Nucleic acid binder design. Structure first.
Ligand SMILES: [Mg+2]
Ligand SMILES: [Zn+2]
Lengths: 55, 145, 57, 189, 104, 68, 144, 143, 75
RNA sequence: CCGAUAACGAACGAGACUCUGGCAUGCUAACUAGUUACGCGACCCCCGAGCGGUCGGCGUCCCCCAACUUCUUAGAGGGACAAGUGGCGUUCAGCCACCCGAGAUUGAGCAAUAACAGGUCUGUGAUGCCCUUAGAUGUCCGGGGCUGCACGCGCGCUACACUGACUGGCUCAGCGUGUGCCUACCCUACGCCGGCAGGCGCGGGUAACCCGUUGAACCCCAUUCGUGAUGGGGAUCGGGGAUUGCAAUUAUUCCCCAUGAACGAGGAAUUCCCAGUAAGUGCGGGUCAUAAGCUUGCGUUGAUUAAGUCCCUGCCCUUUGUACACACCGCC
């Protein structure tokens, strides 16, 4: 709409503020250690990041 | 002295319009009064200068009238204003502690006050449902069946 | 100090950068035989090595 | 010589029957100052025989959920119960305990899977270790139920249970359960 | 100049980090520098446990991901100036170095 | 229970008792050190297992003729 | 008469609770965290702390000034560390400052009565699994 | 045969020190000792009229064992379980106001003074008094 | 076994009953005297510790959860 | 695995492997970890102690102005192999008991062929086909709903009390997090105000440097209560005060005062579990502007029973029967 309601709703906090840095999804995010990544996306890129599986 | 029961021992009392057992501890006796809890009983007895280790039956008539007048008039007796019930009244605004059938009708007075403006809380009260917004899906069944 | 990010967040960031860089190169150099990426990052300047079968491409 | 709880010498108690003599551990070797030692007594089989029986009794009082790790509370319970029984009867508290274990262990029980008459089918004599295991479990349950909703404390309820079991008076919950087990086994021979 | 420098190394695999700790101290001995031994800071374990499924249907399996961060400190404290004497770090990929003097 | 020696520990043991009978002996430790210069064994838990069964054969081969 | 540097430092450990006993040549003083051994937190298990000295004897300790520092674990778990430190310190002090024939007689009394006064309990804890409240327990499962 | 508080029963020592504070009445007792509760997680108020003398005795003892403690440390030491009704229980810190004025009453008694860093410790005067009471609490226990 | 309505304060009949035969039998604890003299229990701990002060009853235990006394020695 | 052997030589799985736990007074070191020593102090002493006792009070890398690594951290290594003894065994593969030993079975991770019309198109700029595409099934904004309650079920929390609750005193952890690409939102010491939740200034920490010696809970020690729906239990409900946010009503959460309901150990049934286990007990992480009765980990206290069986429910191998092959939830 006109420039004063298209994005008018405040999104400084909450699930709406945060999205997966890979797939732009808002569910199952991992904000720990500054990942900001999807629950499913992290499993995909865990090896590349460095998160290996010991036990 | 853990002696024979005192001759002027009242097994129950008659304070306000409720009877309280005299065989139990004084701070845990006046808790039988509506509007008086464990906390409020201790502060009033603390400020009425009565012994804490003695039971309700062995309090004397003058001590039981000192106890009542503390409870009725707590503001004048240095009991703080954060330790009462009807603080900042919705009708008259004065801070007070209500202790009897006055508590039952103040609850009814505020209960009809919500109904008369038919606010949501009054409607929930009138319909007999929860008013604090909790889930009615799987609880509170006993009151209905 | 305050400006520097913590080692825990820092080492996660480098893994994020490598994963993001690998994904971008995987999509782009796919038909060129992109095999992998090696990142020899140094405090002065970083450097990126692309491992591909068909280098002249 | 070791003076369990600082008193009540262990070099005078005695076991009246050789059947239970080697699974009760009140003698000099298994004589301890205190009924508390994380000795790994459940690592293997027949290691709970060389565990002192005061420790065995203490480990069984911590039951019914509320009290699953509270060994220090149980130690003082055993301590207070032992002081009462010496005061209330006049002999060595350990001696009353051994008599309680000996007299409460059910000599036979019944067990099977076939179509039972009343409870179980075939009457089977129990082992000497099951004798002690059942004896300790029965005394603790007797003291537990006796003090669940009365002013009488656990130490006093534990005290009378061991005293009654050490004599056998149809007043201890342990011997009452023991006699009941004998009757079922005897009726199911 | 007179200088004292604290060299902190941090990596993910111990083998490389233990290797790079060697040639700095071994190089300094040839350079006749004083070398406080490599202090081993406690290893940081970053542990992210994510449910294995992407669906939410299953048997409640959880996937444990661990990240080990190893830090080591080497304190090169020769009497003469040190920056010119140690102009190299001789690293391998995976280890981060941060030259630092006593002022910081 | 559950200390059967797998093929590998047994199969390696027989080879090093025919390659190197004279050097080996009936000591777990002396043999566990020869198995450190005569073989490239990836794991420590493997050589000690290999060294352990070697003694069983070397103790047995002193008396009977084992298939090795 | 004034020979210094006659001291040992021997630790004891139960369930992540470590206690280092500082043994030393002096008139008999046994103290833990600066407090007398009698003045200890869970007095219900006081005999466990006094158990080493009672078995070996006050006279054996009499030439030794012990000070134990304890800093881990819980209440009772600390006690097993304090006794393990005191018992292992004196056997070490007798080991490396007099003949081990004296070390032999102190060791057998403690090792026979309770080996934990000289050898530590190796069990620690167990890791919780992602299927139950604890290490082996499992959440209740329902089929309807 | 000297005596230090670490050499005596702490529970009887704090009982002795509170008695010493009570008869030697200079301790700045607040006007709300009768009304307040000593922490948020406590359902009922303290039983003893002289609770302010017993915390002060207790806290003066704590500053002996370790100094540099502030109000935030005191409310941690005195914090405890909050049963939270039907909620699962948790840990709740004590009251900052009770802790603060107990400490403030102690500087006024010249037995506690502030540190060069945050928090406050015992003065040599206060350390003198703590250990004499320790002296007489051992003699009474002994004989 | 419905309700005990124990005494919360003594009457004359129970008070001398306390003083004449309670300090005569081996195990005297507040629980025992409560269920024998029909006193509530706070009175039991009360009455027992007054009898200690007079010295006609000997204390042995004195613990928070269990306080145990005994009669005076004879002979 | 050992052995017979129309089989011989192999392959995957198991095992080996990886991580973790338990021992190393043996090595390498540590002013971002300490301990002993010494020197200052502060006290108690005082008989007189004096190398007295206590101090998480202060120093000796504020480099010449202590040592050392026991305790802490983490690397290289060692250590356990059924190795030794006795017995059983075809005296093979192996089993049982015991000595010495920290340990004579620590927990996990990975995990074969073949398959399921098992779940996910609501994870994806993974995707085919179909549908919609400007009055949109795109996108944004406002409000509401996802919470709504005659009722049924599942996972749990709190309990029914005295092996307790309450009030005070005492005294012990370990995982692990901590200021942001977008992105606004960190962990908090200390001082002051307030009864509490909180508020106000001053700092520290991108972290073995600051929170923090994480002064946790249970427990322990004293007090009151006294077998009653009671000081058990805290559901429901009224009034008041704060915090987060743009917004708190259908109560966000927190605090204070009042009401004090069922519940007195739970029918038929049914779950999980073998040693630091069950259970009691709290504490971190995730979610998180606001928040845990959830989950993932951690420590603390610490047992009863059992070292067996195929009885029930199932699994593996062989033999056998079969009208079954969508395979007994079959066929008829
Ligand atoms: Mg109450
Ligand atoms: Zn994603």
């Amino acid at each position: 709409g006109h420039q004063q309601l298209y994005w008018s709703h405040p999104r400084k906090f909450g699930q709406g503020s945060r999205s997966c840095r890979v797939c732009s999804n808002r569910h199952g995010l991992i904000r720990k250690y500054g990942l900001n990544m999807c629950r499913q996306c992290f499993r995909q890129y865990a090896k590349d990041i460095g998160f290996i599986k010991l036990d | 002295m853990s002696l024979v029961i005192p001759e002027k021992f009242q097994h129950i009392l008659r304070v306000l319009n409720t009877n309280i057992d005299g065989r139990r501890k004084i701070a845990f006796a006046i808790t039988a009064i509506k509007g008086v809890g464990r906390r409020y009983a201790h502060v009033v007895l603390r400020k009425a200068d009565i012994d804490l280790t003695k039971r309700a039956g062995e309090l004397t008539e003058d001590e039981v009238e000192r106890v009542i007048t503390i409870m009725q008039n707590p503001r004048q007796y240095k009991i703080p204003d954060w330790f009462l019930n009807r603080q900042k009244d919705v009708k008259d605004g004065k801070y007070s502690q209500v202790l009897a059938n006055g508590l039952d009708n103040k609850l009814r007075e505020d209960l009809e006050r919500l109904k008369k403006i038919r606010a949501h809380r009054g409607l929930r009260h009138f319909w007999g449902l929860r008013v604090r917004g909790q889930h009615t899906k799987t609880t509170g069944r006993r009151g209905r069946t | 100090m305050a400006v520097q990010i913590s080692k825990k967040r820092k080492f996660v960031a480098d893994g994020i950068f490598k994963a993001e860089l690998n994904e971008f190169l995987t999509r782009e150099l796919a038909e060129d035989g992109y095999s992998g990426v090696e990142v020899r990052v140094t405090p002065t300047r970083t450097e990126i090595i692309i491992l591909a079968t068909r280098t002249q491409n | 010589d070791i003076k369990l709880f600082g008193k009540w010498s262990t070099d005078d108690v005695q076991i009246n029957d050789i059947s239970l003599q080697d699974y009760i551990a009140v003698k000099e070797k298994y004589a301890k100052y205190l009924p508390h030692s994380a000795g790994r007594y459940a690592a293997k089989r027949f290691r709970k025989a060389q565990c002192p029986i005061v420790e065995r009794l203490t480990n069984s009082m911590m039951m019914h959920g509320r009290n699953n790790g509270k060994k220090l509370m149980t130690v003082r319970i055993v301590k207070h119960a032992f002081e009462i029984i010496h005061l209330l009867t006049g002999e060595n508290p350990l001696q009353v305990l051994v008599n309680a274990i000996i007299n409460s262990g059910p000599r036979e029980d019944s067990t099977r899977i076939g179509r039972a008459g009343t409870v179980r089918r075939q009457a089977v004599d129990v082992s000497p270790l099951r004798r002690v295991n059942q004896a300790i479990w029965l005394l603790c349950t007797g003291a537990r139920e006796a003090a669940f909703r009365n002013i009488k404390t656990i130490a006093e309820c534990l005290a009378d249970e061991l005293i009654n079991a050490a004599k056998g008076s149809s007043n201890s919950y342990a011997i009452k359960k023991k006699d009941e087990l004998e009757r079922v086994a005897k009726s199911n021979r | 100049a007179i200088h004292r420098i604290r060299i902190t190394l941090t990596s993910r695999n111990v083998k490389s980090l233990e290797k790079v700790c060697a040639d700095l101290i071994r190089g300094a001995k040839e350079k006749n520098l004083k070398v406080k031994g490599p202090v081993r800071m406690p290893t940081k374990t970053l542990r992210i446990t994510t449910r294995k499924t992407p669906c939410g249907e299953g048997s409640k399996t959880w996937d444990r991901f661990q990240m080990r961060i190893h830090k080591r400190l080497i304190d090169l404290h020769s009497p003469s100036e040190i920056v010119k004497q140690i102009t190299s770090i001789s690293i391998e990929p995976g280890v981060e170095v941060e030259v630092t003097i006593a002022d910081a | 229970m559950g200390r059967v020696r797998t093929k590998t520990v047994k199969k390696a043991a027989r080879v090093i008792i025919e390659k190197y009978y004279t050097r080996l002996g009936n000591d777990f430790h002396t043999n566990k050190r020869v198995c450190e210069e005569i073989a490239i064994i990836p794991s420590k838990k493997l050589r000690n297992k290999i060294a352990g069964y070697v003694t069983h054969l070397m103790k047995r081969i002193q008396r009977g003729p084992v298939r090795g | 008469s004034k020979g210094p540097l006659q001291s040992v430092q021997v630790f004891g450990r139960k369930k992540t609770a470590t206690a280092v006993a500082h043994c030393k040549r002096g008139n008999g003083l046994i103290k833990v965290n600066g407090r007398p051994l009698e003045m200890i937190e869970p007095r219900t298990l006081q005999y466990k702390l006094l158990e080493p000295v009672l078995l070996l004897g006050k006279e054996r300790f009499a030439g030794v000034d012990i000070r134990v520092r304890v800093k881990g674990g819980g209440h009772v778990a600390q006690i097993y560390a304090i006794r393990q430190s005191i018992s292992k310190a004196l056997v070490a002090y007798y080991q490396k400052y007099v003949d081990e024939a004296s070390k032999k007689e102190i060791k057998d009394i403690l090792i026979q009565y309770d080996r934990t006064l000289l050898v530590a309990d190796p069990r620690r804890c167990e890791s919780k699994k992602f299927g139950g409240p604890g290490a082996r327990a499992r959440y209740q499962k329902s089929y309807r | 045969p000297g005596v230090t508080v670490k050499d005596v029963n702490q529970q009887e020592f704090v009982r002795a020190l509170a008695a010493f504070l009570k008869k030697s009445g200079k301790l700045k007792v607040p006007e709300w000792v009768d009304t307040v509760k000593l922490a948020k997680h406590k359902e009922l108020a303290p039983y003893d009229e002289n609770w302010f003398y017993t915390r002060a005795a207790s806290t003066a003892r704590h500053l002996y064992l370790r100094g540099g403690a502030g109000v935030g440390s005191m409310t941690k030491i005195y914090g405890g379980r909050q049963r939270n009704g039907v909620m699962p229980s948790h840990f709740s810190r004590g009251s900052k106001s009770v802790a603060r004025r107990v400490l403030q009453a102690l500087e006024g008694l010249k037995m506690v003074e502030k540190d060069q860093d945050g928090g406050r410790k015992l003065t040599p005067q206060g350390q003198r008094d703590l250990d004499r009471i320790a002296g007489q609490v051992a003699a009474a226990n002994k004989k | 076994r419905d309700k005990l309505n124990n005494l919360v304060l003594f009457d004359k009949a129970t008070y001398d009953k306390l003083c004449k035969e309670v300090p005569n039998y081996k195990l005297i604890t507040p629980a025992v005297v409560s269920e024998r003299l029909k006193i509530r229990g706070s009175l039991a701990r009360a009455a027992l510790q007054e009898l200690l002060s007079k010295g006609l009853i000997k204390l042995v235990s004195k613990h928070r959860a269990q306080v145990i006394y005994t009669r005076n020695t004879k002979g």
